[PDB]
Design a protein around this ligand. Structure first.
Ligand SMILES: NC(=O)c1cc[n+](CCCn2ccnc2/C=N/O)cc1
Ligand SMILES: NC(=O)c1cc[n+](CCCn2ccnc2/C=N/O)cc1
Lengths: 540, 540
């Protein structure tokens, strides 16, 4: 037994495991319980801190994945199954993982806290692409990642009641952040240099912690990848959250016909149902047929979020804060094979204009007929209004701009103009091992494997240029964690990454080629979403 | 060493296995290849007989399941998992199984041949509910069950071409019937007393072998359980079969962008696609939103079926043939949860009047607005036209009568009036271990476990009375297989089972109570489907 695999924390002792990288070993502590199991009477309730334990807790393997829907659209397909749970499903899932270099750093080291995405209905910290053994070995930093409750178990909200207050999945993340403040020093980490970074729903979660006062004192830097809290999918109304929760209870037989009419007996009936029963009816509570919309998401309850995320961003101070935001080239292509008519991953998806007009109503739900007419005007090439290849790219840009790119550009503009130093990027490299069709380009979620240094894994068929590209990306994220600046504090030979300002709107392209500075995060297209369309809906 | 576990057939030698029953041992020969693997260039082609092999083929375990869609509507639910494949999926699946008593019968024994159901898109002969160790031990008969290609691999039809002629899944069953004629004597079976029996799509398959001359001379008695070849779901036209096959090719990228669209190049493109790719787009070719409809079913091609099953039944002679038909009480309740609005297995499914009107358009597709009005009249109790419990039962009877009961009642009428001795039953016992909700009553598919003597398995939690009831049904089915008459030839004390005639229309009820003769297989309801509705559609 080695001396660096035994660590004592405020709850007790843990035995870690020594992972192996092509360039040196690394210590890991996988499966640390940071909360009591939210089972039985504690379902839908905020997390309670883990009670101290006797003996040594085995932290050599990942723990259970929180109960979640499992994607069955393309069974056996690598592109979809790489995001499915790789452990057993259980409500006993509130566990975090810590990677630390070997030998353990004798000086305090910056800490990176990863929050997985998955539309607030799925995801796990044990996926292969979230392996932090390569980022910790190459850049000698401390990586922490936790599981949080997703779906109804983490975001079912009956606003007003105390049996289902909502946003408990966000409280799972906050409790894990407090755990890092109280225990990351035992692993060689600096609790005064914590960098939150997440992707999609994790990026939205990172943004919601910026807007929540109790969570702001737990980290110092933020990285939002392909997501933002002001997105049209990230939050839901107090009344809509009550309707979605009530219909879910109706589908599972709650309340028993017909006694009961208050939230106390409604939640009491939900707590008796098996976990899989609630999951099988999760998608049946959405109001409309749509893509990029999810049943149970964070709610604006006045507690965790005192107001809407857009309001908190406009009227907030962000001085002394470094933020790194960015998107991929084709944000919307991934979500079109999940409901848009005429789209299939097994053909070229050469849609007609009739299918394009129907896809706009699916990609942009809850809009008037006039608002839909404005969308098809701005995204139609009127020289070739019937070209299937251009209509395919157009609908991909419609979903991408409406859901990811423009809410990110809106957030990045307000952050830089209110004190924060913001850096922006656009990931434009398609991995050579990508199993999705070519017409999707660089889809949503496929920059994560390069940030985590997955191409360094010799058992995978990546190219030599992609391995160098992975190390360069790991340097950017690490430099931003230590200094708050992605540039190398002493490098003059490499091109510089200029900050993003509301006026110049400068960003860089991440590719196999060196850095290239550009201007405008789709400024012309996002002016329609952020400026005009709000006013087009105010007048019905 | 047991000598009765080594059998030589016309292809080679086989090593069997001796299974255990609470009343004695039984020899089993599971996984006997009866055809060459239909892979590569043989996909969509008729089966070729298995060429003789050297050595000894191991017949001690079930072989692979044919490629098929897997139900993911209720993951982990016993009611649906029990029909999913229990072996690896592979196109190498043409294997049959033989159960024979120990000691091997020294006299020729009648042979039962089982054909599984599953809407021609799924099913396997290796399911636990199809285990023939109990029927063979208790009644000392020979039970044979085979796999046949389902879905597109067994019923994709481009009529006209020889690259995808259609009905090859039915030809897989015929080749297994010819195998029984040539080799069942080696197991102690009588090839002059072969009794076909299937359920749902298997029952329709048994009915289609009665109407095909080449298959007629391979068996002598037939049992059709909850299915008939004249059902609105069992067949499809040559034009519709071409449209469904062409769209499936389009969804998988066939033909390539700029290639000719003839049948030779189209089937050649489908043979290059992986098996799972064709399965993932199987349900995307149905024309309308409907229940109890399946993509690739047998086609009326003029070869296997010279005319429609309805025509061949009317213009056919059935003298010297004993048929046993029957249905369960609640045939339609199972299919409601797959798409009828307001239906869910986890609540009471107390639908409204508006949901009932929408469910009629789903349960009875392809009909005009006036035809749907007539269905609403016959199945609405106008004294309580909005009672949710009565509307739930009404839509269950709508789907049950339209798809199962009335197509069965018409088949039994024309058979008895044209020389065949027909016996009819109605299964009315709900199993005590049934996991489906109580409002479904006796769902479709849950009499099979009692015919196969599953309650005799000690590991199951069935009641004592259900074991005696299982032995009764095994006696009825065996007596029919032996003599063509389900009644006991030695016991005049038990109530007799009278034949079904076109005038008296007599049947019996099967439950824990003794036999009870009734009259009319939904005579008033089926007169609407079999007599009036065809005339209502002729005048549009
Ligand atoms: N069982 C169903 O009918 C069903 C419907 C919709 N979904 C939503 C798929 C997820 N999705 C939709 C739009 N974008 C996404 C995200 N995919 O990662 C799943 C299942
Ligand atoms: N949304 C889908 O991908 C889909 C899956 C399965 N189906 C068919 C389910 C099975 N079924 C439908 C109607 N009747 C049945 C019988 N099931 O046993 C339809 C659509």
């Amino acid at each position: 037994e080695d001396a660096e695999l035994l660590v004592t924390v405020r709850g007790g002792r843990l035995r870690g495991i020594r992972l192996k990288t092509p360039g040196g070993p690394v210590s890991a502590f996988l499966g640390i319980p940071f909360a009591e199991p939210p089972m039985g009477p504690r379902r839908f309730l905020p997390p309670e801190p883990k009670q101290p334990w006797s003996g040594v807790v085995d932290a050599t393997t990942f723990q259970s994945v929180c109960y979640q829907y499992v994607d069955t659209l393309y069974p056996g397909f690598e592109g979809t199954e790489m995001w499915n749970p790789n452990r057993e499903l259980s409500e006993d899932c509130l566990y975090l993982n810590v990677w630390t270099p070997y030998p353990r750093p004798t000086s305090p080291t910056p800490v990176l806290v990863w929050i997985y995405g998955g539309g607030f209905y799925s995801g796990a910290s044990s996926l292969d692409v979230y392996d932090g053994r390569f980022l910790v070995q190459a850049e000698r930093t401390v990586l922490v990642s936790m599981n949080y409750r997703v779906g109804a178990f983490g975001f079912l909200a009956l606003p007003g009641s105390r049996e289902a207050p909502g946003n408990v999945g966000l409280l799972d993340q906050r409790l894990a952040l407090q755990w890092v403040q109280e225990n990351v020093a035992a692993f060689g980490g600096d609790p005064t240099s914590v960098t939150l970074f997440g992707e999609s729903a994790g990026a939205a979660s990172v943004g919601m912690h910026l807007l929540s006062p109790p969570s702001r004192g737990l980290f110092h830097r933020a990285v939002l990848q392909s997501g933002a809290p002001n997105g049209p999918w990230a939050t839901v109304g107090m009344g809509e959250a009550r309707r979605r929760a009530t219909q879910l209870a109706h589908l599972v037989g709650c309340p028993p016909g017909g006694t009961g009419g208050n939230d106390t007996e409604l939640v009491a009936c939900l707590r008796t149902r098996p976990a899989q029963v609630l999951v099988n009816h999760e998608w049946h509570v959405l109001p409309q047929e749509s893509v990029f919309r999810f049943s149970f998401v964070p709610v604006v309850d006045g507690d965790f979020l005192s107001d809407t995320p857009e309001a908190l961003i406009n009227a907030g101070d962000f001085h002394g804060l470094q933020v790194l935001v960015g998107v991929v080239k084709d944000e919307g292509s991934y979500f079109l094979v999940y409901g848009a008519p005429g789209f299939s991953k097994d053909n070229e998806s050469l849609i007609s204009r009739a299918e394009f007009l129907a896809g706009v109503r699916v990609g942009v739900p809850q809009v008037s007929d006039l608002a839909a007419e404005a969308v098809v005007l701005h995204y139609t090439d009127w020289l070739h209004p019937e070209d299937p290849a251009r209509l395919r790219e157009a609908l991909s840009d419609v979903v991408g701009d409406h859901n990811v790119v423009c809410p990110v550009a809106q957030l990045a503009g307000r952050l830089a103009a209110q004190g924060a130093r913001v850096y922006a990027y656009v990931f434009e490299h398609r991995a050579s091992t990508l199993s999705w069709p070519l017409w999707m380009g660089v889809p949503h979620g496929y920059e994560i494997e390069f940030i985590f240094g997955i191409p360094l894994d010799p058992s995978r068929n990546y190219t030599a240029e992609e391995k160098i590209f992975a190390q360069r990306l790991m340097r950017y994220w690490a430099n931003f964690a230590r200094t708050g600046d992605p540039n190398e504090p002493r490098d003059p030979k490499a091109p510089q990454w200029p900050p993003y300002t509301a006026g110049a709107q400068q960003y860089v392209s991440l590719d196999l080629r060196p850095l290239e500075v550009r201007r405008g995060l789709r400024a012309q297209a996002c002016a329609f979403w952020n400026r005009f369309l709000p006013k087009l809906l105010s007048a019905t």
